[PDB]
Design a protein around this ligand. Sequence first.
Ligand code: FUC
Ligand code: FUC
Ligand code: CA
Ligand code: CA
Ligand code: CA
Ligand code: CA
Ligand code: CA
Ligand code: CA
Ligand code: CA
Lengths: 122, 122
Amino acid sequence: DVDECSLGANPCEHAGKCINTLGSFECQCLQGYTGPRCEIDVNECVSNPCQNDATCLDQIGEFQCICMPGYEGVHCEVNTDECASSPCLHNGRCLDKINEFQCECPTGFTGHLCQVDLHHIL
Amino acid sequence: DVDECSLGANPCEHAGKCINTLGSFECQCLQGYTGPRCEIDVNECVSNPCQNDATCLDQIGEFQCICMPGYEGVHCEVNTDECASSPCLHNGRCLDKINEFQCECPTGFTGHLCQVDLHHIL
Ligand SMILES: *[C@@H]1O[C@@H](C)[C@@H](O)[C@@H](O)[C@@H]1O
Ligand SMILES: *[C@@H]1O[C@@H](C)[C@@H](O)[C@@H](O)[C@@H]1O
Ligand SMILES: [Ca+2]
Ligand SMILES: [Ca+2]
Ligand SMILES: [Ca+2]
Ligand SMILES: [Ca+2]
Ligand SMILES: [Ca+2]
Ligand SMILES: [Ca+2]
Ligand SMILES: [Ca+2]
């Protein structure tokens, strides 16, 4: 037997661990590397994990998503609820949109956030 | 002398008060009426009191302004401060616009209202 893990070069790529066997050898790859000699940097983005027009970053052993505005979450799968902070004053009904919200104001109030009091006028 | 205030018709228009004089008469007009016999409904809008593309209503003895969105006040002269209610979360800097606002979020926060916490990701 030749110990392939004790020759001039490590036959395993991307710093995989070489393990000698009788008649051959094997590679123990670092996370994110595949192939008999760890030759392939796995594409973690190949199944399109990033949703809603997000950008997928293909990294070592992982992906990361960069979300479009209005979206959040590991997969950009959550439409952020802009109504969650109750931005509409005076019990205005908050309507959630994409990176935006609308307020439907009760009688006597107007403006984007229902700020403007009209009661004195009428 | 003829009492012009005791003839068939009141010579004063728009329910003005007729006052007899010796040789003539005079009219005491209701508010918002002008002319010797109160013939003219004053145009309270003639000097354009309603600002910022507002609609002026020419009324009896008064005007009223209907403001464009983002404006308030008797003359629609006030640009409503949408930042007044502190809509930006996490000490985001609020920039006032017309019937709208923008948030400039601090490091680690994003979204229209700085809602989205990125600290765990980075
Ligand atoms: C990656 O980032 C996201 C947010 C989008 O702007 C994409 O177009 C870009 O490639
Ligand atoms: C009167 O109302 C204001 C708010 C504007 O919409 C004008 O165009 C209208 O005549
Ligand atoms: Ca061997
Ligand atoms: Ca990868
Ligand atoms: Ca939303
Ligand atoms: Ca808004
Ligand atoms: Ca007279
Ligand atoms: Ca008038
Ligand atoms: Ca404003």
